[PDB]
């Protein structure tokens with residue numbers, strides 16, 4: 001499964017069941033459901049705090065232990081915080097920080113020109129500075145994963161979360177194939193591929209590396225500047241496979257300056273070895289994110 005942390009061949013904190021108090025469901029997938037909950041005695045000078053709890057729907061017990069081990073390793077400002085597990089009785093639970101604004105795709109769409117309707121964001125569409133801040137934070141999380149030699153394989157805005165103060169982090173609760181089924185191409189009986197985010201070598205040769213994740217980051221950058229639109233939305237799944245393998249590139253979004261579109265094309269070099277590194281991509285976006293109003297006003 002592309003995006004499943006256990007596809008990486010690289011101690012776990014435990015929380016008592018009495019310390020977790022379920023509030024309501026946030027979502028559900030084929031592997032289980034997610035709830036908002038209050039977690040007691042988790043962090044000092046807080047006493048009580050909101051968390052997102054993933055409940056497991058055997059080999060699944062072994063998958064759970066391996067997932068928990070890998071999630072414990074990931075500790076970064078731009079990776080969704082994993083607090084630990086609850087193993088006393090059933091269902092087994094995984095506890096994560098709660099991200100108020102939900103997934104990045106939903107956040108972009110709700111703050112784009114097609115939205116229906118102010119604590120963390122100004123009225124109307126997200127400005128250039130805000131779009132650059134979002135992009136920079138996702139790149140920072142990808143720099144951290146590249147540094148640990150982790151290959152995501154399902155990087156996309158749906159697989160990022162947005163918290164209070166527009167803090168953006170990479171992470172998901174394993175429900176993207178259920179919530180965003182049209183973002184995947186169904187092969188056989190259960191295989192679902194995020195082809196629109198995949199480079200030619202991943203589609204043609206099934207090779208996944210730090211470089212295929214750079215390509216996916218370029219597509220993320222494109223989703224950010226189109227306010228969450230699906231890449232190749234005008235194409236069917238087979239038509240998108242044809243365009244990607246033929247070497248066609250996503251058009252410059254209207255809200256995207258040429259400086260940013262350059263960073264996107266740098267992620268989309270046909271040859272994996274010639275794609276810019278995530279360190280270089282993050283350095284450029286961060287520089288543009290923290291540029292003074294005088295400098296990015298002439299970019300916009």
Ligand SMILES: Cc1ncc(NC(=O)NC2c3ccccc3-c3ccccc32)c(-c2ccccc2)n1
Nearest residue numbers: 003004005031067079080151152170171172173174
């Ligand atoms: C069946 C299925 N399909 C996709 C899934 N998604 C992931 O493994 N996402 C990882 C990930 C994968 C690469 C790199 C980083 C990170 C990361 C970081 C924070 C939070 C979550 C993740 C899961 C799943 C299993 C346990 C807990 C949460 C999700 N389960």
